[PDB]
Design a protein around this ligand. Structure first.
Ligand SMILES: Cc1cn([C@H]2C[C@H](O)[C@@H](COP(=O)(O)O)O2)c(=O)[nH]c1=O
Ligand SMILES: [Ca+2]
Ligand SMILES: [Ca+2]
Ligand code: NA
Ligand code: NA
Ligand code: NA
Length: 316
DNA sequence: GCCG
DNA sequence: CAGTAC
DNA sequence: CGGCAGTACTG
């Protein structure tokens, strides 16, 4: 990234817009920042900037200001509420609408939230683990967590496949959470193994809090045994074997990579989700499409006309 | 905010 | 449903 | 002008 002296400035504005609820302007800013990071050739002109995809006239003027004047004046008018809104919306379960409500009510600190705010169960758990959830763990610990869940699961059925996805699967040195995807090549055993698996993990003391409990998805909190351990975010999902590939893609991310693949699919009349890649999905402005066989991620790429990207090149 |  | 998360 | 990904728990 030869343009850090621009992305540094633009990330602040993107975050201000994001915490203040201007989701689409924040998205545009983020895509332009990805463009900047991906150029590998320091932009040294307004025409070179205005010519990069994801970067238009507004962003070109911002960048030219940063280039010549070494500073962007918009940054001097970020609302004073932004640091408080960021503090509040880093609580798991609270987003921009709750952060802004809390701000309007006069709250300015987590002590205010603790003593005065009305919290959901999820928010009370997120506040209780605030510092822990802001940390990333070494991928070695992620391995230990994956293996804990895989041992718990493979006791019910040694044929179950358990794969840790997310940044872990993209090969990052640290991970903000662990996301375990479970399936069985038999196609008809992933029923009941989910509830009993969670009962097992809870009996061992491994699971400490539940955030979301659905028929297919679990999101919660775990902690490995012993000293020097923190609480970590853990997701577990169980899927039929026929969806395994599409799950692996989706839950491996990144989020920008997925959103790009899904935009592309949408262009070619297809629809891509965590369940299936469908074709001739009818839309406008009920679209029961046809599911396409995707036994491997490579098949998803191929059906979309793309070369296969390994998980490590999927940052955006 | 960007792009069709 | 709106809000939130993935 | 208008989409910007698509799906699933909570309350
Ligand atoms: C944050 C986010 C992630 N994802 C996908 C890509 C991430 O690698 C995967 C796991 O999410 P995570 O990074 O929060 O654990 O979920 C989405 O589909 N949408 C989102 O908004
Ligand atoms: Ca991750
Ligand atoms: Ca614009
Ligand atoms: Na461009
Ligand atoms: Na939050
Ligand atoms: Na996750």
């Amino acid at each position: 990234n030869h343009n850090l002296h621009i992305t540094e400035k633009l990330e602040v504005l993107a975050k201000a817009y994001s915490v203040q609820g201007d989701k689409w302007r924040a998205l545009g800013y983020a895509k332009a920042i990805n463009a900047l990071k991906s150029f590998h050739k320091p932009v040294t002109s307004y025409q070179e900037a205005c010519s990069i995809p994801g970067i238009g006239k507004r962003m070109a003027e911002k960048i030219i200001e940063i280039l010549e004047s070494g500073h962007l004046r918009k940054l001097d008018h970020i609302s004073e509420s932004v640091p408080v809104l960021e503090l509040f919306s880093n609580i798991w379960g609270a987003g921009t609408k709750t952060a802004q409500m809390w701000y309007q009510q006069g709250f300015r600190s987590l002590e205010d939230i603790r003593s005065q705010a009305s919290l959901t169960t999820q928010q009370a758990i997120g506040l209780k683990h605030y510092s822990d959830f802001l940390e990333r763990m070494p991928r070695e610990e992620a391995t230990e967590i994956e293996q804990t869940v895989q041992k718990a699961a493979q006791a019910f059925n040694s044929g179950l496949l358990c794969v840790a996805c997310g940044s872990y699967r993209r090969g990052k040195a640290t991970c903000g959470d662990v996301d375990v995807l479970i399936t069985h090549p038999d196609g008809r055993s992933h029923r009941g193994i989910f509830s009993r698996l969670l009962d097992s993990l809870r009996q061992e003391g491994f699971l400490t809090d539940d955030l979301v409990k659905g028929e297919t998805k679990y999101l919660g909190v775990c902690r490995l045994p012993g000293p020097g351990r923190r609480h970590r975010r853990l997701d577990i999902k169980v899927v039929p074997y026929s969806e395994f590939a599409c799950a692996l893609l989706y839950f491996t991310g990144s989020a920008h990579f997925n959103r790009s693949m899904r935009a592309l699919a949408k262009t070619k009349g297809m629809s891509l989700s965590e369940h299936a890649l469908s074709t001739a999905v009818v839309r406008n402005t009920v679209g029961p499409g046809r599911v396409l066989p995707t036994p491997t991620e490579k098949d998803v790429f191929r059906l979309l006309g793309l070369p296969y990207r390994e998980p490590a090149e999927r940052d955006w």
